[model samples]
Target: GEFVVEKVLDRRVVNGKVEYFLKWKGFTDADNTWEPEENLDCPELIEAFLNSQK
Candidate 1:
């Protein structure tokens, strides 16, 4: 199955690191119904999905 990057949020976080919340509609967040506003520090985790494509 092919997953899509729905949205990307670029913000300045701790240590000048970029933080983004990749809210998945369902396919990506199939493990849980975590979307947009109800997430935390997604950058650390969201990146995993992107890296997997490499």
Candidate 2:
């Protein structure tokens, strides 16, 4: 199945780096996935999600 990144739920420092917990657009909380910041292709999504909160 295809998924759109919804929001970043939580983050933590791991080995001096940051990772984000991404919630899917149409998926449940159980489907959220952990992804390294550098690997994300759509930073606009990340920015929009974060901007929406602030």
Q: Judged by lDDT, which candidate is best?
A: 2
lDDT of 1 by residue, 1-54 (tens): 434445443333555454454544444643333234234434545566557545
Model 2 alpha-carbon miss at residue 42, Å? 2.6
Best candidate, TM-score = 2
Question: What does candidate 1 score in Cα RMSD to the true structure?
Answer: 9.4
List TM-scores for all candidates, in order.
0.30, 0.60
In model 1, pairs of residues that clash are none
lDDT of each: 0.45, 0.75
lDDT value, candidate 1, whole model: 0.45
Number of residue pairs clashing in candidate 2, backbone atoms closer than 3 angstroms, sequence gap of 3 or more or interchain: 0
How far residue 50's Cα lies from its native spot in candidate 2, in Å, is 4.2
